[PDB]
RNA sequence: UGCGAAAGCAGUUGAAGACAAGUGGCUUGUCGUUCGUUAAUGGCCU
């Protein structure tokens, strides 16, 4: 379910700006900021600050301080404006709002007197929230949601203090509860390998998912349904998925748990206090192109043993499905004993593979379609016959007739035995056009060359043939063109391939004029044998003879 | 939650007995000529002729009461042979019908409102394995019975006699004979006429049955003139006949097209001659002045005798098989069309028409499927030639033995029909030969019938040498699955003995309809895409991802693929992207698949599953090479690559099954397939066999063929339903009769089709004054 | 039973009756009656000529001008008409009565180039001569204009108004520099100027929001509510001389505007989809003053083209007894105020032809004969040959013929082998007839002359097809 | 029409096209005429376009097609495709016109990315011709 | 007739019974016969 994985304040901007993150720092005073600029003043700082936010303009910023307040700072001009200290316990993770979107004084004790992004624009006291520990601010219809260790879930909207929904959400101690990119859910992580996407319209867990690796820092990107989970003892953020018009690739949010890996873009080199190297360059989650690579949460190579029907007693109503051996022996124990016989202590002779192919399932010395085949059994059989044992007469006539070899066939141009190579170049469909092309541009020109040209027209696409033959040795093709001009339709279509491959100008005139005479007698034989192909009353008086 | 329920209607089920008929039609009317009692194989239909709807059906599975007569396994030749109007037991006393099938099973079926659940399943004694007919008048009903030679049955006339022994009908045994090659009954039933073949030559008799009145025989060597004493057997051979109700006139329609008229006393000869093919349909009027004639030309031709001339009816869009007038004053012509543009099935077409302007009232169809071969006793009608549509006279025993022993000794019996389902109104399209049949199975009839080629389907009756001018057969048409376009592709043939007669050539076009009309207008045509002389066999339509089902990608047996999307700036259909890998080999065993969000293109070539992307029409070779596998290779020659949803998948080959996961890029599971199928299919046919659900997978159908104790004429549907990518055999539904295809109707259900064409589904004081005034209303 | 089966630029090229009337000098520009342009005027030298929509020649004219006259313009009511000359004494006088002169008032002594009335007001008339000032005279008191509309750098030359916005007058000089004055202003400044480059040829306002100016070898558009250009077009040999606009007429284009550019062809753009021509039709040289009639010409609609030589091309589109009648009086009632209405009509279809009914009655021989006559159409012959090959047997269609009947078949395959769509099928035709009729040509040795002539021209055509195939092979190599 | 019978086939006014083409996805040698062809391909004017392209001579066609601009060679080749689509009776001397744009201009149409999309008339028409060329050579032999 | 592909690849090409005709008998041709092999100037309306 993953994506392309790599990389082993102002929450919408990025680089080339002044200062998008005047961000808080652990083991510092309160905060710092760096350019890849603007000031980082005192916002009634010097508290137990672990986070920091602003008015998203980098000129009216603040320092979120654990004193129940948020007083303004001056980051560009020098004239800070007044405020109002609302609570008196802890506001070290405070955040200003937009022009009347989402502001309430629920600092650390659930004291949610609603207000605006101002000190004097006050609203009703929505202080009916219980003892909560998970306070989130989302932009569905701007809403502060509380998940509580008295366990419950609720959401209120700061428009006219409209408590939207809520129930008894059994939320235990989790790791990372980010909002979802669709905004109607939240990925609330369970401890080791799990993160449940809970639909934040009714506080109900919609999909409780398992995690492929360790999930310690989960943050949902500006994507369709993609999040990044950074591991515990590393800066590696695995990119998984379960904002689509101009999908962001970097500078979405500032959350990780790596080696001081805050301000988390894809290219997260330019950090606030870290000043580290760079990472990924991947965009948001695609439609169905990323999921073909991102095979996370399940990694296995298995197959069934060809399960039959749920046994049907039809001895009075037989199916006419065979006059031969319908149900064959798919005995994996017999196949394992036969392969261990082939790679057993008789291996000095070719009888060790001949009698093993005999004592294996009913393959009639050349024939497939009794598919006694699991992938591991197949590749270990292929390894015990491709080891250090062109020798056997039963098995090496059974294996031109196999559609599955899968790229160990580079050896086929190097090994040079006549009849096994002939069966392999007529039957087995795994011998690439590179090997086909150099075996074609051999200049001994026999029925081996005829059969591989028949195979290149039987299996291999013309565009791949062209773009593979574009750049190769010119001496072989010019020597073969001179030989054939001195002294079959497979060779003539190969001539069409190479005489589209020639390009425009990179030849001479005498060899091509003799080739023009060769193709002149080609057009005359073509016209004369298609001509061969579509080739394939009473007058007034006479003098007659008759007997008397 | 899934179960078998066979629902919709089937064939009209006439007298499918070669020469064992003279009428072959018992679709009767009431004595108040307003409702039509027509039998089927699957129903009894009662039609209101003033509205052409069904006021009441009597279905052949809703009552075990009746369907104990016909619900068996191999003896499903229980066809229905005679309908009478009143209660036969009580003398004429109110209006409920009686019904005989082929075994002499007397049924007294109710006729108005809702039926009473006690049908008098009476049975006469001798009727064990026969019923030719019974013939009706006042009081006396006389049964024509058949016993067992030279392939000639024996016909006996017994009388149903039933006076006071109220629980037994007893036969009375009037007449006997042992030789019949052709026979016929009058239009009033009071007279019949047969032949006897009894050499110094063949002979013809005309007999009465209700009296001693007229019982005579004579050799037809006198009726055969010297020209047909001399020339060939198509001129010597009687094709059809007719008698009059009076008993003084016998029509013999000879196989050349001449219609002899002979008298009774003097036995003169009189010749009627317009028909060029053979003649199959001859009947007199009740007054006996007009002779109704229907032959292999598409015309209904009626002769006035005392001018010896004719009134025509030009385009009946088929082949007339039997016809008579049946109004008591003679206002209604009942007849049977057949329309042999598909030679596979004897798919007839019952209709009557008025005598006023010869307008047709209540064309009664069955579902007309498009098979690949003959089915089960599918003989061919008698023409002068052994053409591509039928056999000749001399090949009767030859072709019946050839077909019977071919089904005995054959192993190739697929005949898998391709259909479609309309997402506008959920009616199923039977794409006919150069045409369609839009069947709305909710009330088991049709709605219209559009021609789909610019051929010689309509404007000419096919005659003796033009029968081998077969029409351009369509293969399939694709719905845009918002229900907007018929994208049809058809192959076409030339007449033989021509140099251009070699190739079978290809043409596609595009049809738009609104929800108002039932026909489709032609937007545009494309003659041979992918270049000339290339099949366009597999074309896939798209979901609503791109432009609300505008994608249709055409493919090839060679392996080339083009993309085709509609547009509106060009108010026309055109293509988008181009690919033709010109392999110098070809293979018509190709499947395809496409992702429902529009990401992956799957070319299931001859055992290679090549993968293209959607966006750039090519093999996806990314910038990482970490299991971006865009080329599979399967175990053997596949026939389906099917995507149930974007994660997992089923591919089907000849020998086994395989399941694929693509997010987790591996294989999953496997089932056996060669233990089910031996050699039954042609290549590419598993695609039209199985079709996926939107959610719950597919239903792989076991093809079986029940052995003798070679296959016998018992057949199979032991279909086992699968759920969610090869997981559960949650239902083994057993059935005693064959199947051709299974489709998904959008209420998560699966409609299957029988060959005996029954569509079904596996799925999920003042009161006294008012009453007496109601009695005094009429 | 059923029946038997049967087997934009066109609007602007169904404009015809293009007649010519040569003047004695060039045609400056023209005019149209705004309430009903069933008459129109052209500005000949020392006379103005006025023509109808019916007789298509001069129905009235005035020729007691003393110098060459420049501008002819109807008032919006369409009763009187203005005319400015080279003398600079601009004359207004009543139309539909030429021999009276209402008032001839002098402008500046420079030649009054353009003079047009207010587009909605009926008593104020804009004049412009080469005095570098334009004037809004008032015809009630024509002794001094209300506005001395000054503020030009050089040569005010083409005036127009804004239609729905009254106080905005769009004048154009030979400086680029399209001015638009407010009539309540001081008459010395526009509120802004539009930056054309060339000297403007003339400007019209096609919207109350969008004007089009033309000058030099490309024309420009100008938005007036925001001072913006969205469009230019410059596909002309010389400068676009004159412009015209029309709204809501009978075409597959809702509203049109034409530009005429001294190069024969006049171009018909459209503000429906930003100014593309359907097709432009040429004329007999330097096209100076060209326009079609406005909207309410009501069917009959004229385009006129007065060239710089002076010839006017006019191309116009144009779409028993009482007792017996009382015997057959009830013929038109058609069922209005009574209960039910039947309708059972068969339709008189398109004209079925003799070859068509020959196919319908299997009259194949005379179908072939009706195919191979010069009176019938060539593509009709191709289609009937294709359709009867697809329908019937050519053997039984040719079962009894001889070479005197066969010769128009060969005589038309002589020219039909060179076709693109029927080449191989007419080759199949001659293939069948020579496949079964060698005995006829070996009895009568005549038609082998056409066989050998056919042979040499088909060797020419097979050489032509071969070289065309190898030229697209060149395209394939240089892909 | 009797609704107990089949409705009839018709084409109406369908747009007939085969499945090929798509649009949406100082002298010192000889002084041969250039600027009249430039103003001819400014407009689409048959008269002056014929008086520039009525040519028949080998060197004249060479010098004309090369000494014009390569920004008009695409639409000039498409106008010659229009000519061979309008008629193929007189095809001999104007096949030279069609071929020399492909001969003497080699790099420009290759550097142009969309050849077969905008050029969907010329090689599609010549392959509509050369489709039946095996059939035409079979028929003529 | 079988497979397969718009392709080639292998085979039937029998027998009995009855009848017809030419010469009791013989000789030539068929069969709305059991069995086996996969093998007739007569043409489309209102």
Swiss-Prot record, chain A:
Q: Where in the cell is it found?
A: Nucleus, Nucleolus
Chief location category? nucleus
Question: Which superkingdom heads the taxonomic lineage of this protein's source?
Answer: Eukaryota
The record's GO molecular-function terms, alphabetically, read: tRNA binding; U3 snoRNA binding
Q: Which Pfam families match?
A: Utp8_b_propeller (PF10395), Utp8_C (PF22542)
**What are the GO BP annotations of this UniProt entry?**
maturation of SSU-rRNA; maturation of SSU-rRNA from tricistronic rRNA transcript (SSU-rRNA, 5.8S rRNA, LSU-rRNA); positive regulation of transcription by RNA polymerase I; tRNA export from nucleus
Sorted UniProt keywords = Nucleus, Phosphoprotein, Ribonucleoprotein, Ribosome biogenesis, rRNA processing, Transcription
Q: Name one GO cellular component term.
A: rDNA heterochromatin
- InterPro entries for the chain: Utp8_b-prop, Utp8_C
Annotated disulfide bonds: none
Q: What else is known?
A: Present with 16800 molecules/cell in log phase SD medium.
Q: How does it assemble?
A: Interacts with snoRNA U3. Interacts with MPP10 and UTP25. Component of the ribosomal small subunit (SSU) processome composed of at least 40 protein subunits and snoRNA U3. In the absence of snoRNA3, forms a complex with other t-UTPs. This complex can associate with pre-18S ribosomal RNAs.
Q: What does this protein do?
A: Involved in nucleolar processing of pre-18S ribosomal RNA. Also has a role in nuclear tRNA export. It acts between the steps of tRNA maturation/aminoacylation and its subsequent translocation out of the nucleus. Required for optimal pre-ribosomal RNA transcription by RNA polymerase I together with a subset of U3 proteins required for transcription (t-UTPs).
Name this polypeptide is given: U3 small nucleolar RNA-associated protein 8
What's the source species for this entry?
Answer: Saccharomyces cerevisiae (strain ATCC 204508 / S288c)
From Swiss-Prot, chain B:
* WD repeat residue intervals: 274-313, 469-521, 531-574, 584-624
Q: Which UniProt keywords apply?
A: Nucleus, Repeat, Ribonucleoprotein, Ribosome biogenesis, rRNA processing, Transcription, WD repeat
A Gene Ontology molecular function term for this protein is: U3 snoRNA binding
The record's subcellular locations are: Nucleus, Nucleolus
InterPro entries, per the entry: WD40/YVTN_repeat-like_dom_sf, WD40_repeat_dom_sf, WD40_rpt, WDR75
Task: Tell me which Gene Ontology terms the entry assigns under biological process.
Answer: maturation of SSU-rRNA; maturation of SSU-rRNA from tricistronic rRNA transcript (SSU-rRNA, 5.8S rRNA, LSU-rRNA); positive regulation of rRNA processing; positive regulation of transcription by RNA polymerase I
Pull one GO CC term from this UniProt entry: peroxisome
Stored PANTHER family: WD REPEAT-CONTAINING PROTEIN 75
Quote additional remarks. Present with 6560 molecules/cell in log phase SD medium.
Known role: Involved in nucleolar processing of pre-18S ribosomal RNA. Required for optimal pre-ribosomal RNA transcription by RNA polymerase I together with a subset of U3 proteins required for transcription (t-UTPs).
**Stated name of the protein:** NET1-associated nuclear protein 1
From Swiss-Prot, chain C:
Task: For this UniProt record, give its keywords in alphabetical order, as a comma-separated list.
Answer: Nucleus, Repeat, Ribonucleoprotein, Ribosome biogenesis, rRNA processing, Transcription, WD repeat
Pfam families given for it?
A: UTP15_C (PF09384), WD40 (PF00400)
Compartment list: Nucleus, Nucleolus
GO BP annotations, alphabetical order: maturation of SSU-rRNA; maturation of SSU-rRNA from tricistronic rRNA transcript (SSU-rRNA, 5.8S rRNA, LSU-rRNA); positive regulation of transcription by RNA polymerase I; rRNA processing
Q: Return the PROSITE patterns for the record.
A: WD_REPEATS_1, WD_REPEATS_2, WD_REPEATS_REGION
Gene Ontology CC: one annotated term: nucleoplasm
Q: How does it assemble?
A: Interacts with snoRNA U3. Interacts with MPP10. Component of the ribosomal small subunit (SSU) processome composed of at least 40 protein subunits and snoRNA U3. In the absence of snoRNA3, forms a complex with other t-UTPs. This complex can associate with pre-18S ribosomal RNAs.
What protein does this entry describe? Answer: U3 small nucleolar RNA-associated protein 15
From Swiss-Prot, chain D:
Q: Any extra remark in the record?
A: Present with 33100 molecules/cell in log phase SD medium.
Q: What does this protein do?
A: Involved in nucleolar processing of pre-18S ribosomal RNA. Required for optimal pre-ribosomal RNA transcription by RNA polymerase I together with a subset of U3 proteins required for transcription (t-UTPs).
Q: Which organism is it from?
A: Saccharomyces cerevisiae (strain ATCC 204508 / S288c)
Per UniProt, subcellular location reads as: Nucleus, Nucleolus
Q: Describe, as the record does, how this protein assembles with itself and its partners.
A: Interacts with snoRNA U3. Interacts with MPP10. Component of the ribosomal small subunit (SSU) processome composed of at least 40 protein subunits and snoRNA U3. In the absence of snoRNA3, forms a complex with other t-UTPs. This complex can associate with pre-18S ribosomal RNAs.
Protein name according to UniProt: U3 small nucleolar RNA-associated protein 5
Q: Spans of the WD repeats?
A: 67-107
**What family is this?**
Belongs to the UTP5 family.
């Amino acid at each position: 379910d993953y994506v392309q994985v790599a990389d082993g304040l102002m929450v919408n901007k990025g680089n080339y700006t002044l200062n998008v993150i005047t961000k808080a720092l652990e083991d510092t005073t309160d905060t710092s900021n760096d350019h890849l600029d603007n000031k980082a003043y005192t916002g009634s700082d010097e508290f137990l600050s672990q986070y920091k936010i602003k008015a998203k303009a980098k000129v009216m910023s603040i320092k979120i301080d654990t004193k129940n307040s948020l007083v303004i700072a001056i980051l560009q001009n020098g004239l800070i404006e007044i405020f109002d200290f609302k609570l008196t316990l802890l506001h070290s993770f405070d955040i200003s709002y937009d022009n009347l979107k989402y502001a309430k004084w629920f600092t650390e004790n659930g004291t949610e007197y609603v207000f605006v992004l101002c000190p004097l624009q006050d609203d009703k006291v929505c202080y009916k929230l219980l003892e909560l520990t998970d306070c989130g601010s989302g932009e569905s219809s701007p809403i502060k949601e509380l998940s509580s260790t008295i366990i419950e879930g609720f959401s209120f909207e700061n428009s006219k203090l409209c408590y939207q929904f809520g129930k008894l959400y059994k939320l235990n101690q989790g790791k990372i509860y980010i909002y979802s990119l669709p905004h109607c859910q939240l990925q609330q992580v369970i401890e080791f390998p799990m993160v449940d996407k809970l639909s934040p319209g009714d506080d109900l867990i919609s999909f409780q998912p398992v995690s492929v690796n360790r999930v310690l820092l989960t943050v949902n990107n500006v994507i369709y349904l993609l999040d990044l989970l950074h591991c515990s003892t590393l800066s590696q953020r695995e990119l998984t998925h379960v904002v689509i018009n101009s999908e962001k690739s970097h500078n979405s949010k500032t959350i990780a748990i790596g080696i001081s890996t805050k301000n988390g873009p894809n290219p997260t080199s330019s950090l606030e206090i870290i000043n580290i190297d760079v990472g990924t360059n991947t965009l948001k989650d695609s439609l169905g192109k990323s999921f073909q690579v991102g095979n996370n949460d399940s990694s296995v190579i298995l197959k069934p043993l060809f399960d039959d029907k749920d046994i049907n007693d039809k001895r009075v109503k037989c199916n006419d499905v065979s006059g031969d051996s319908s149900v064959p022996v798919l005995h994996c124990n017999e196949v394992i004993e036969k392969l261990s016989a082939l790679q057993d202590n008789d291996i000095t002779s070719f009888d060790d593979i001949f009698f093993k192919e005999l004592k294996i399932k009913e393959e009639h010395y050349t024939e497939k379609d009794r598919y006694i085949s699991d992938p591991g059994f197949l590749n270990k059989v292929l390894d015990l016959i491709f080891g250090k044992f062109p020798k056997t007469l039963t098995f090496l006539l059974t294996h031109p007739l196999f559609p599955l070899s899968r790229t160990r066939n580079l050896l086929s141009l190097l090994r040079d035995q006549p009849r096994l190579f002939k069966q392999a170049i007529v039957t087995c469909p795994n011998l690439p056009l590179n090997e086909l092309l150099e075996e074609l541009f051999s200049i001994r020109n026999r029925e081996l060359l005829l059969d591989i040209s028949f195979r290149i027209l039987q299996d291999f696409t013309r565009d791949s043939i062209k773009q593979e033959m574009k750049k190769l040795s010119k001496l072989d093709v010019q020597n073969f063109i001179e030989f054939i001009t001195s002294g079959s339709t497979q060779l003539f279509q190969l001539l069409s391939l190479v005489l589209d491959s020639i390009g425009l100008f990179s030849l001479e005139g005498a060899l091509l004029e003799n080739l023009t005479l060769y193709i002149d007698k080609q057009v005359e034989i073509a016209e004369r044998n298609t001509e061969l192909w579509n080739l394939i009353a009473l007058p007034t008086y006479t003098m007659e003879y008759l007997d008397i | 939650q899934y179960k078998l329920s066979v629902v919709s209607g089937g064939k009209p089920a006439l007298n499918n007995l070669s020469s064992v008929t003279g009428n072959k039609n018992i679709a009767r009317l009431s004595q108040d000529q307003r409702n039509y009692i027509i039998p089927f194989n699957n129903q009894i239909k009662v039609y209101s002729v003033e509205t052409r709807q069904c006021v009441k059906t009597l279905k052949f599975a809703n009552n075990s009461l009746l369907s104990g007569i016909f619900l068996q396994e191999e003896e499903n030749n229980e066809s229905i042979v005679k309908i009478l109007l009143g209660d036969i037991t009580v003398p004429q006393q109110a209006h409920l019908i009686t019904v005989f099938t082929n075994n002499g099973h007397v049924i007294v079926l109710n006729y108005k409102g809702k039926l009473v659940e006690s049908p008098k399943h009476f049975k006469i004694s001798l009727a064990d394995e026969k019923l030719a007919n019974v013939f009706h008048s006042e009081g006396n009903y006389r049964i024509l019975t058949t016993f067992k030679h030279n392939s000639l049955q024996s016909y006996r006339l017994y009388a149903l006699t039933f006076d006071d022994a109220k629980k037994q009908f007893e036969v009375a045994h009037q007449a006997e004979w042992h030789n019949v090659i052709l026979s016929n009954i009058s239009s009033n039933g009071k007279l019949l006429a047969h032949m006897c073949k009894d050499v110094e030559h063949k002979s013809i008799s005309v007999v009465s049955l209700f009296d001693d009145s007229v019982n005579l025989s004579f050799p037809l060597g006198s009726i055969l003139s010297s020209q047909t004493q001399s020339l060939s057997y198509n001129t010597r051979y009687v094709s059809s006949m007719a008698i009059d109700n009076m008993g003084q006139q016998l029509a013999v329609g000879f196989a050349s097209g001449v219609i002899s008229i002979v008298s009774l006393a003097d036995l003169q000869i009189r010749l009627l001659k317009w028909h060029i093919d053979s003649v199959l349909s001859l009947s007199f009027s009740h007054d006996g002045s007009y002779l109704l004639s229907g032959g292999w030309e598409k015309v209904m031709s009626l002769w006035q005798l005392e001018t010896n001339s004719q009134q025509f009816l030009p385009r009946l869009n088929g082949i007339i098989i039997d016809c008579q007038v049946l109004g008591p004053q003679g206002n209604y012509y009942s007849l049977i069309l057949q329309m042999t543009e598909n030679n596979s099935n004897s798919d007839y077409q019952f209709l009557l028409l008025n005598a006023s302007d010869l307008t047709s009232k209540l064309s009664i169809n069955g579902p007309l499927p498009v098979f690949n071969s003959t089915i089960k006793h599918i003989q061919q009608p008698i023409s002068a030639m052994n053409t591509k549509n039928s056999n000749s006279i001399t090949s009767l025993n030859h072709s019946k033995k050839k077909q019977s022993r071919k089904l005995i000794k054959s192993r190739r019996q697929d005949f898998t029909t391709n259909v479609e389902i309309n997402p506008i109104n959920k009616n199923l399209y039977f794409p006919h030969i150069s045409a369609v049949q839009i069947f709305d199975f909710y009330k088991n009839e049709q709605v219209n019938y559009q021609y789909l080629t610019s051929g010689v389907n309509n404007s000419m009756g096919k005659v003796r040498f033009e029968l081998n001018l077969q029409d351009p057969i369509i293969t399939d048409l694709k719905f845009t699955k918002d229900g907007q376009w018929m994208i049809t592709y058809e192959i076409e043939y030339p007449p033989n003995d021509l140099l251009s007669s070699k190739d079978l050539t290809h043409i596609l076009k595009f049809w738009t309809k609104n929800d108002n009309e039932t026909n489709w207008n032609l937007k545009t045509k494309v003659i041979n895409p992918h270049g000339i002389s290339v099949p366009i066999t597999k074309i896939l339509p798209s979901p609503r991802s791109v432009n609300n089902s505008q994608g249709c990608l055409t493919a090839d047996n060679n392996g080339g693929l083009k993309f085709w999307s509609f547009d509106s700036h060009e108010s026309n259909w055109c293509l988008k992207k181009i690919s033709l890998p010109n392999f110098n080999h070809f293979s018509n065993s190709v499947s395809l698949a496409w992702s429902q969000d529009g990401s992956l293109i799957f070319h299931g070539f001859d055992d290679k599953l090549q993968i293209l992307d959607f966006d750039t029409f090519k093999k996806f070779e990314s910038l990482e090479n970490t299991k971006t596998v865009s080329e599979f290779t399967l175990d053997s020659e596949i026939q389906t690559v099917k995507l149930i949803n974007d994660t997992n998948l089923i591919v089907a080959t000849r020998t086994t099954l395989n399941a694929i996961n693509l997010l987790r890029g591996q294989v999953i599971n496997s089932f056996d397939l060669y233990p089910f199928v031996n050699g039954v299919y042609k290549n590419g046919h598993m695609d039209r066999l199985i079709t996926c659900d939107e959610r719950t997978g597919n239903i792989a159908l076991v093809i079986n063929q029940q052995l003798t104790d070679v296959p016998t004429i018992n057949y199979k549907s032991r279909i086992i339903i699968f759920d969610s990518d090869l997981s559960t055999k949650l239902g083994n539904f057993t059935h005693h009769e064959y199947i051709s295809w299974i489709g998904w109707n959008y209420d998560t259900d699966f409609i299957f089709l029988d060959i005996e064409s029954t569509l079904g589904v596996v799925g999920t004081n003042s009161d006294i004054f008012a009453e007496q005034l109601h009695k005094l209303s009429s | 039973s059923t029946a038997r089966p049967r087997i934009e630029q066109r609007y602007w090229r169904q404009y015809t009756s293009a007649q010519l009337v040569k003047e004695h000098n060039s045609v400056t520009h023209i005019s149209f009656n705004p309430q009903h342009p069933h008459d129109f005027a052209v500005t000949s030298s020392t006379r103005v000529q006025i023509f109808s929509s019916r007789t298509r020649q001069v129905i009235k004219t005035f020729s007691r001008f003393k110098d060459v006259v420049y501008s002819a313009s109807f008032r919006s009511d369409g009763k009187l008409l203005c005319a400015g000359d080279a003398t600079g004494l601009v004359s207004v006088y009543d139309s539909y009565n030429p021999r009276t002169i209402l008032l001839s008032i002098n402008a500046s002594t420079h030649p009054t180039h353009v003079t047009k009335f207010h587009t909605q007001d009926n008593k104020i008339l804009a004049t412009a001569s080469d005095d570098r000032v334009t004037r809004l005279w008032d015809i009630s008191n024509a002794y001094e204009p209300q506005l001395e509309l000054t503020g030009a750098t050089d040569y005010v030359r083409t005036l127009s108004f804004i239609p729905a916005a009254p106080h905005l007058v769009a004048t154009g000089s030979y400086d680029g520099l399209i001015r638009l004055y407010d009539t309540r202003s001081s008459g010395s400044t526009p509120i802004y100027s539009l930056n054309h480059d060339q000297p403007v040829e003339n400007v019209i306002a096609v919207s109350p929001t969008q004007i089009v100016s033309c000058g030099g070898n490309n024309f420009k558009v100008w938005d007036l509510t925001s001072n913006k250009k969205l469009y230019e077009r410059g596909n002309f040999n010389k400068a676009v001389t004159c412009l015209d606009y029309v709204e809501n007429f009978d075409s597959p284009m809702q509203s049109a505007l034409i530009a005429s550019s001294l190069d024969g062809h006049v171009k018909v753009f459209d503000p429906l989809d930003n100014f593309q021509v359907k097709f432009g039709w040429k004329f007999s040289g330097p096209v100076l003053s060209c326009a079609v009639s406005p909207s309410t010409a009501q069917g009959n609609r004229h385009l006129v083209a007065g060239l710089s030589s002076g010839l006017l091309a006019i191309r116009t589109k144009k779409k028993k007894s009482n007792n017996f009648q009382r015997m057959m009086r009830g013929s038109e009632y058609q069922g209005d105020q009574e209960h039910i209405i039947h309708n059972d009509k068969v339709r008189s279809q398109r004209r079925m032809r003799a070859f068509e009914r020959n196919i319908n009655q299997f009259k194949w021989s005379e179908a072939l004969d009706n195919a191979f006559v010069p009176g019938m159409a060539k593509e009709l012959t191709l289609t009937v040959l294709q359709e009867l090959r697809k329908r019937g047997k050519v053997r039984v269609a040719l079962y009894g013929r001889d070479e005197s009947t066969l010769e128009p078949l060969l005589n038309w395959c002589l020219k039909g082998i060179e076709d693109v769509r029927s080449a191989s099928i007419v080759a199949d035709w001659v293939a069948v007839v020579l496949e079964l009729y060698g005995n006829t040509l070996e009895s009568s040795p005549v038609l082998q002359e056409l066989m050998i002539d056919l042979k040499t021209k088909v060797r020419h055509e097979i050489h032509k097809s071969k070289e065309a195939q190898r030229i697209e092979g060149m395209l394939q190599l240089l892909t | 029409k009797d609704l107990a019978s089949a409705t009839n086939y018709v084409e109406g006014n369908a747009r007939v096209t085969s499945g090929d083409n798509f649009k949406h996805v100082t002298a010192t040698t000889t002084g041969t005429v250039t600027v009249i062809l430039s103003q001819a391909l400014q407009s689409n004017d048959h008269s002056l376009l014929e008086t520039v392209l009525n040519n028949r001579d080998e060197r004249v066609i060479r010098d004309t097609i090369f000494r014009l601009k390569p920004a008009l060679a695409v639409i000039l080749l498409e106008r010659l495709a229009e000519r061979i689509a309008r008629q193929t009776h007189r095809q001999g001397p104007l096949n030279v016109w069609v071929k020399w744009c492909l001969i003497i201009h080699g790099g420009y149409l290759v550097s142009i990315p969309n050849l077969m999309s905008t050029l969907s008339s010329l090689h599609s028409t010549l392959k509509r011709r050369s489709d039946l060329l095996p059939r035409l050579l079979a028929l003529d032999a």
